[PDB]
Amino acid sequence: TRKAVIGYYFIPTNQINNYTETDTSVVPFPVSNITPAKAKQLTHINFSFLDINSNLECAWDPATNDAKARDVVNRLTALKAHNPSLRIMFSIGGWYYSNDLGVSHANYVNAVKTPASRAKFAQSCVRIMKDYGFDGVNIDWEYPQAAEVDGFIAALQEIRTLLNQQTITDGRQALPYQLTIAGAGGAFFLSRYYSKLAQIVAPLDYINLMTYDLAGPWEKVTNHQAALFGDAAGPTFYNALREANLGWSWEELTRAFPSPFSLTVDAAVQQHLMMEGVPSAKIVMGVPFYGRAFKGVSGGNGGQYSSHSTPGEDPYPSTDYWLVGCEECVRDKDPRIASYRQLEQMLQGNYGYQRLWNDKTKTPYLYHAQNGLFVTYDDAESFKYKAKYIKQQQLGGVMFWHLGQDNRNGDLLAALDRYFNAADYDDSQLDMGTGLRYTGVGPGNLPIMTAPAYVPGTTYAQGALVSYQGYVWQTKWGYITSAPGSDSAWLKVGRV
Amino acid sequence: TRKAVIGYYFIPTNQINNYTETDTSVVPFPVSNITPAKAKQLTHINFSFLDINSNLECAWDPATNDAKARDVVNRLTALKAHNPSLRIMFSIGGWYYSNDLGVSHANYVNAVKTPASRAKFAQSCVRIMKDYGFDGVNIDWEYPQAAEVDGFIAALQEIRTLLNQQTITDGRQALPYQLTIAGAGGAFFLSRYYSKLAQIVAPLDYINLMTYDLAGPWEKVTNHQAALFGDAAGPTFYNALREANLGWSWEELTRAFPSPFSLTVDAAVQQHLMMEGVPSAKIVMGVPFYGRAFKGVSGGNGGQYSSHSTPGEDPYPSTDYWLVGCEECVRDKDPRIASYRQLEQMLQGNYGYQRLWNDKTKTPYLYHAQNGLFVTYDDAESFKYKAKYIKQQQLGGVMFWHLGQDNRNGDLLAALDRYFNAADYDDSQLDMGTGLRYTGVGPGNLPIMTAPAYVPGTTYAQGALVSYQGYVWQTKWGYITSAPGSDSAWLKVGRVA
């Protein structure tokens, strides 16, 4: 099964309204930059962002000139002429619109609250899809809270129902309409809906994990924003999943959610796989086509795991653009984020940066010794390890934010495509290293075991192992006289 | 309110069938040993044991001579002439009949299963009570678990309904018929039904905690079997309550159920008080009138906290009776348990025992240095502390197993009565020591706390405290933009005044 390669195409409204393919000062990344070859390396383009309005329907931002927008979307759907598997999805949400303190947060909450609002919303999603010529719906609410989860689930189910009907009405059995969400890639946000993950994922083709932004200036210690595995020298974090409303026992929680833990890509993937009903084939790993930069860092560790003096507020609370060599930063008025495109130029520009490598996390970083700067980012080398993990763990594919941040040659996207599909690329000897793996155990990833059948009437000592009801069970204390499922002394530890 | 003093009267079927008050080789403890004075010191006697038969009704052991059973019971109920507050309860169950592997366990499980079975069972309990002349029902099922607990609760509720009606019917409002149960006194068995404790206690006058047998030859390390408070030097245990189906978060479970912990009387009492809807006045502290003995012990701490070479299996699998001076142990064929009566004789018999005291646990112990023996037991001195605790914690009173194990003069019973009621006993200056207290805190026993109201639209940092919807809540991490508190990030830590 081909791995998904899902790239976000993000275009602000003002660029839609002044769309040109011939003036990078005004549209830095027009659709013509997605050449036939790039189009064939993608399986999905997530056109981003639409919103939910005060009518509680899916909708464009109101300042959008519609003719321009329809024109931009038509350029994207024309790309399917080059790749008959390509889908142009549209995204609803994103952080700006849907975070808890976000300008449209209330509509997210309200759209999913009643059967009626859920049917109105779901219909509006399909209507927009069909009117503009999109191939599916990607919902990026960051993030429904436990109260809202049942309504969000019901909304996803309704959209799935409608999309499946529309696939049959449109003869699209060869390329059915799809439904995806952007999912949390870290335990803190994931804990909002984690307990009902199976229900959330059932209506989806893919859950695209935002396994990036795991470090940033809002954290006191500099760190890798998308470490594949952990580094014991790096910071560790409270495992918020142990507080989710699971109804699990203390042993079950502890075994599933070691705390503190390393906030890594592997952690997020394994946390999903720990739940029953979450198939690996639906999990897509997100990767960033940008780096995060920090100032006021100290020496010793190449800028890693340092205090820093980087404001965390949005917007950037000042006019000081201190990321030496970053032209895009001054245009975008924020020195804390830089595209891969720009970082590559900075690095080869003699600006004082050193590119280093963490062989535990399998990610690169830049250190600027003169100025005390640190940058965490991803590149074609870190993507070798991430692609090997996607294959080894039987994940659905990769997602990235965003296409316009690749270099002009499209090298990050090409690398992803190469690692999954090139007949002359061989990663059999790629060493995945000794970084820390997430070792929790949950109902969804119990190890296969054998044990003698439980015998009623028998008394068992502590640590005794039995098979019962198709699982392997262990006693937590001694003199156990009733059965697994019926005596809390038994812990489910394996699967027959 | 007078403290309850609840004494078990246990008589096996063969002793009923051969009952005599003039031959202690046949009946070691006839009812005649209970004098008017002892009767006045008791509030309840639990006559023990009746059972549940395969017809799922309350019944005597079918081997019982019914005439003889009625005569024994009459001797007990005649004691009410001396104490107008005294109740002769009868007990249904006990370990032998009702443990999971016990001879009648299925009948317990099945009697409580349906409204019809519960009605027939409850009606049989009141019938027996009235036919033999008892004053109430004590259910001693050791112990319901799992799917049985809802049945058990509904059974208790039905017994209560029928007893309250019987009270009116009979004109017994001055001494209404009562309902009690024997409850687990340690967390492993308590975990079976702990989550539903409030529903179990609602229909009861008292829950009598079996806060003994907390040590024994079945455990690898010698210890006190009824320590009041903990000793850091002694063994600690897994806190099984953590595995009860409570729906609490990891933080909630950890704060309520420290682990490992000291398996003590105080721990059981506070574990009960941790649950919402469990009144202290209904909790009765059990105490043992017997000790437990171990052989093969080491000497650095008077035999305490030692490995040992004592079989833990039952019955005693050997013919070797090694508890020096314990002729009772010979008669009963088990050197690992001895009545207070017998232990006190051993102490007067110059056999080589040393009586020692642990000032943390507030319990005595015997050490035989020559033979490597250790005995854990309770006496009138440990009861001073336990009675003071019952007063301070506002418990309902004391229960003990069993009357027959007191000395012939009834000194342990007289001591409990003294400590609760005597004018000339003053425990105001009794120092309860520095032994370890159980200090778990449950979402049902949160302290009053004070914090600023939660402000929507506010971002809160880790460890911030706010008041919201009747509770004080703490954040477990930062950048919290959600409201308290099913939300994972908020921990209920206190109650708003």
Side-chain angles (χ1 to χ4, degrees), chain A residues 1-326 328-494 496, chain B residues 1-219 221-306 308-485 487-497:
Chain A
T1 300
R2 182 177 178 178
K3 300 299 182 197
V5 176
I6 306 186
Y8 273 86
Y9 182 87
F10 172 67
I11 180 167
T13 305
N14 73 276
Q15 290 185 29
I16 295 166
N17 290 353
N18 294 290
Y19 184 81
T20 168
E21 314 205 303
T22 52
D23 200 344
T24 75
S25 47
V26 158
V27 170
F29 193 71
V31 180
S32 49
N33 285 16
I34 309 169
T35 49
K38 292 179 196 167
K40 292 163 168 228
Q41 295 164 355
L42 288 151
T43 60
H44 301 65
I45 294 165
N46 287 343
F47 175 87
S48 298
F49 287 107
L50 272 72
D51 202 14
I52 301 171
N53 66 13
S54 147
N55 208 53
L56 306 187
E57 281 180 322
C58 172
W60 300 80
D61 154 8
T64 309
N65 170 308
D66 193 52
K68 303 288 291 162
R70 292 181 172 270
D71 176 65
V72 171
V73 170
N74 292 340
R75 294 174 188 265
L76 286 162
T77 55
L79 299 168
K80 295 160 57 178
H82 311 297
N83 173 3
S85 295
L86 181 66
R87 289 178 176 89
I88 313 302
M89 310 283 281
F90 73 100
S91 298
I92 302 170
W95 179 261
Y96 172 72
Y97 289 140
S98 76
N99 82 88
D100 290 351
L101 305 188
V103 285
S104 301
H105 181 250
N107 306 157
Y108 284 81
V109 176
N110 294 148
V112 300
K113 279 217 305 209
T114 66
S117 67
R118 286 194 296 267
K120 181 159 175 195
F121 175 59
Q123 287 270 352
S124 63
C125 294
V126 177
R127 185 167 62 255
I128 291 285
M129 193 191 63
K130 283 302 301 244
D131 186 18
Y132 289 84
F134 292 114
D135 299 310
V137 185
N138 176 59
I139 309 192
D140 187 0
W141 181 0
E142 302 180 20
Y143 307 85
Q145 295 167 211
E148 305 150 5
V149 170
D150 283 344
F152 175 76
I153 290 163
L156 295 169
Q157 289 164 350
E158 297 301 314
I159 296 167
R160 168 56 59 186
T161 292
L162 292 180
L163 285 178
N164 279 5
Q165 293 177 359
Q166 199 66 54
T167 289
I168 302 309
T169 296
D170 297 354
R172 287 278 285 257
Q173 295 84 345
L175 193 72
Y177 299 115
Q178 290 191 335
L179 178 58
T180 62
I181 72 175
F188 298 104
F189 283 125
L190 179 59
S191 71
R192 289 166 163 223
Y193 57 85
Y194 187 70
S195 60
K196 290 167 188 180
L197 241 196
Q199 289 176 254
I200 287 160
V201 172
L204 312 181
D205 293 279
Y206 304 108
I207 181 164
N208 301 159
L209 301 191
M210 289 177 290
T211 34
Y212 47 70
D213 301 337
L214 303 180
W218 57 89
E219 289 297 323
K220 273 182 74 92
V221 170
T222 61
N223 187 29
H224 302 273
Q225 71 150 333
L228 179 55
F229 299 118
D231 179 359
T236 60
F237 288 92
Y238 187 101
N239 199 149
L241 304 181
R242 76 184 187 179
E243 297 297 294
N245 187 12
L246 287 159
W248 295 2
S249 81
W250 188 99
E251 298 283 353
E252 292 153 353
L253 291 171
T254 295
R255 84 163 338 153
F257 312 122
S259 191
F261 80 110
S262 296
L263 197 63
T264 64
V265 180
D266 166 68
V269 170
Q270 293 309 303
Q271 287 161 349
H272 283 71
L273 293 169
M274 283 199 308
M275 293 292 289
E276 300 166 294
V278 181
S280 66
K282 288 193 180 182
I283 302 172
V284 166
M285 183 196 290
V287 300
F289 279 23
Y290 63 98
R292 290 189 174 274
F294 304 71
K295 63 178 179 82
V297 308
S298 298
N301 297 295
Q304 300 172 109
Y305 317 147
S306 178
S307 63
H308 68 273
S309 63
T310 318
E313 292 92 1
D314 286 321
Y316 178 64
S318 118
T319 114
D320 181 21
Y321 310 126
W322 36 260
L323 190 60
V324 186
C326 192
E328 285 172 7
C329 291
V330 184
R331 145 202 107 188
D332 292 341
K333 302 182 165 157
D334 192 341
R336 303 176 296 182
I337 291 273
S339 68
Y340 174 82
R341 186 181 299 201
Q342 185 64 82
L343 292 172
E344 181 171 77
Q345 299 168 165
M346 288 160 54
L347 237 196
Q348 62 203 3
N350 195 206
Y351 287 111
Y353 296 97
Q354 317 160 23
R355 182 197 178 271
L356 299 165
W357 181 260
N358 185 308
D359 204 39
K360 298 259 173 184
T361 64
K362 296 299 191 175
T363 54
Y365 52 113
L366 308 183
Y367 178 56
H368 199 280
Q370 173 198 35
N371 282 27
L373 319 174
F374 169 80
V375 185
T376 164
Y377 75 108
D378 270 85
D379 67 3
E381 199 185 350
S382 64
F383 287 175
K384 293 179 173 188
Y385 301 94
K386 284 170 181 189
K388 179 162 179 174
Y389 185 92
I390 285 168
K391 289 184 291 177
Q392 298 181 314
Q393 293 284 326
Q394 297 196 290
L395 308 187
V398 71
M399 165 285 271
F400 57 90
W401 174 272
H402 67 84
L403 283 151
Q405 291 177 327
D406 204 350
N407 68 9
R408 274 152 48 141
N409 273 333
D411 288 339
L412 297 184
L413 169 61
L416 290 168
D417 177 65
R418 176 179 307 117
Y419 305 152
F420 292 142
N421 304 122
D424 54 1
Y425 179 71
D426 174 8
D427 59 15
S428 63
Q429 300 183 347
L430 190 66
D431 168 51
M432 296 292 282
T434 60
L436 309 167
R437 269 61 174 171
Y438 185 93
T439 53
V441 180
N445 77 149
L446 290 170
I448 295 148
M449 302 174 155
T450 57
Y454 166 80
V455 173
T458 302
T459 303
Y460 295 87
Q462 178 178 320
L465 296 152
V466 304
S467 67
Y468 200 51
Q469 307 181 309
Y471 305 86
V472 175
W473 306 79
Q474 189 158 63
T475 57
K476 298 157 196 180
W477 64 79
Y479 303 110
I480 306 310
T481 52
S482 195
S486 295
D487 187 328
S488 311
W490 288 101
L491 174 78
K492 190 171 284 189
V493 296
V496 181
Chain B
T1 164
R2 183 181 180 173
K3 298 299 185 192
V5 177
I6 306 183
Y8 277 81
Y9 186 85
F10 170 65
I11 188 164
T13 303
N14 76 290
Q15 287 187 35
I16 296 172
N17 286 354
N18 296 290
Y19 186 83
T20 170
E21 307 199 312
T22 60
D23 193 343
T24 55
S25 79
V26 176
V27 180
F29 187 69
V31 175
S32 42
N33 283 25
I34 308 168
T35 56
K38 299 179 192 171
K40 284 175 211 57
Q41 291 162 184
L42 285 155
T43 61
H44 303 68
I45 300 169
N46 292 342
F47 175 88
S48 304
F49 288 103
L50 279 69
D51 198 12
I52 307 181
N53 63 20
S54 62
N55 204 33
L56 310 181
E57 292 179 313
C58 181
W60 299 81
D61 171 356
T64 309
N65 184 300
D66 189 63
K68 291 292 292 165
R70 286 181 192 272
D71 175 83
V72 174
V73 173
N74 291 344
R75 291 174 194 271
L76 285 167
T77 56
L79 298 174
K80 294 171 71 186
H82 303 126
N83 178 354
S85 291
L86 178 63
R87 289 179 173 89
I88 311 309
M89 309 283 285
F90 73 100
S91 304
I92 311 173
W95 180 259
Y96 175 82
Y97 288 145
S98 75
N99 84 89
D100 283 4
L101 299 172
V103 294
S104 299
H105 177 255
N107 306 335
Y108 288 77
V109 170
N110 295 133
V112 305
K113 277 195 177 162
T114 64
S117 69
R118 293 186 291 266
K120 181 182 178 166
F121 173 59
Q123 291 149 198
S124 77
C125 289
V126 180
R127 279 208 308 278
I128 289 286
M129 193 195 62
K130 288 307 309 280
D131 186 11
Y132 291 89
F134 294 114
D135 299 307
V137 181
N138 176 55
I139 308 292
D140 191 349
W141 177 357
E142 304 183 16
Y143 302 89
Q145 68 184 139
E148 303 155 7
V149 177
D150 287 348
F152 176 69
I153 292 156
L156 292 175
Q157 290 165 348
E158 173 92 350
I159 295 163
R160 167 53 66 185
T161 292
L162 297 186
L163 290 176
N164 281 12
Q165 179 58 53
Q166 199 67 44
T167 288
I168 296 168
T169 289
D170 290 349
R172 273 284 277 272
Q173 298 89 335
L175 195 72
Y177 300 117
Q178 285 189 158
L179 178 62
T180 61
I181 71 166
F188 300 99
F189 284 121
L190 179 58
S191 71
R192 286 177 170 218
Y193 58 81
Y194 184 71
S195 69
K196 290 171 191 176
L197 246 195
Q199 292 174 253
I200 290 164
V201 174
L204 310 182
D205 293 280
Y206 307 102
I207 181 160
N208 300 335
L209 303 186
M210 295 183 282
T211 35
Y212 42 71
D213 298 340
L214 304 181
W218 53 89
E219 302 282 347
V221 176
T222 63
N223 186 28
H224 298 99
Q225 70 159 156
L228 180 54
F229 303 116
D231 189 352
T236 58
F237 289 86
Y238 187 104
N239 196 332
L241 298 183
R242 273 173 185 201
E243 301 300 298
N245 190 14
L246 292 165
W248 296 353
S249 74
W250 189 98
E251 289 288 359
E252 286 181 320
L253 290 167
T254 300
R255 183 171 187 191
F257 309 126
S259 191
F261 79 109
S262 294
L263 196 64
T264 62
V265 180
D266 166 71
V269 170
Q270 298 303 309
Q271 287 161 172
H272 284 71
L273 290 172
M274 289 218 270
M275 291 300 301
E276 192 172 9
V278 183
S280 65
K282 290 189 177 189
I283 300 171
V284 169
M285 178 199 296
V287 302
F289 279 22
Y290 62 95
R292 293 185 176 283
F294 311 65
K295 70 179 185 72
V297 312
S298 311
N301 197 10
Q304 300 169 107
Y305 315 144
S306 170
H308 69 271
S309 63
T310 325
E313 92 211 52
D314 289 303
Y316 186 62
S318 134
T319 54
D320 170 30
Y321 305 134
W322 42 255
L323 186 63
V324 175
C326 191
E327 305 195 340
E328 189 186 82
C329 292
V330 178
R331 285 188 309 268
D332 288 346
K333 276 193 214 308
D334 189 344
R336 302 162 302 178
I337 183 167
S339 68
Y340 175 78
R341 176 167 176 172
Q342 172 60 273
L343 294 169
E344 181 183 66
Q345 277 157 185
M346 283 152 69
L347 288 175
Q348 281 298 320
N350 199 209
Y351 285 111
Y353 292 94
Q354 189 170 349
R355 178 189 178 279
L356 302 168
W357 179 255
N358 179 312
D359 208 42
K360 295 298 168 45
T361 64
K362 300 302 191 173
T363 51
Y365 55 107
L366 308 189
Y367 180 53
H368 198 103
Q370 180 209 308
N371 286 32
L373 282 24
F374 174 81
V375 184
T376 169
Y377 74 109
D378 271 81
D379 71 2
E381 191 70 11
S382 65
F383 291 171
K384 292 188 180 178
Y385 300 92
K386 284 170 183 188
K388 181 157 176 167
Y389 187 90
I390 285 162
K391 294 182 251 189
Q392 293 176 138
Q393 296 288 315
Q394 295 189 295
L395 303 189
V398 71
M399 171 277 278
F400 57 88
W401 175 272
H402 63 90
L403 276 163
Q405 296 168 323
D406 204 345
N407 67 11
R408 183 67 187 81
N409 279 336
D411 287 343
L412 295 186
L413 173 61
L416 297 164
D417 175 65
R418 178 175 182 230
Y419 305 153
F420 294 137
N421 298 309
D424 58 10
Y425 175 78
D426 177 4
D427 66 9
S428 66
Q429 312 296 315
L430 184 67
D431 193 289
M432 299 288 287
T434 50
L436 303 176
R437 272 70 168 176
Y438 191 93
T439 61
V441 175
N445 47 109
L446 303 166
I448 298 298
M449 292 180 70
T450 298
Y454 170 73
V455 177
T458 300
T459 302
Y460 296 84
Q462 181 182 308
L465 289 155
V466 302
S467 55
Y468 194 57
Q469 297 194 323
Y471 296 89
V472 171
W473 304 81
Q474 191 160 40
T475 57
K476 292 171 267 196
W477 56 87
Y479 298 106
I480 303 312
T481 56
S482 38
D487 175 71
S488 56
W490 290 99
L491 177 63
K492 182 186 299 173
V493 296
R495 289 176 302 123
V496 170

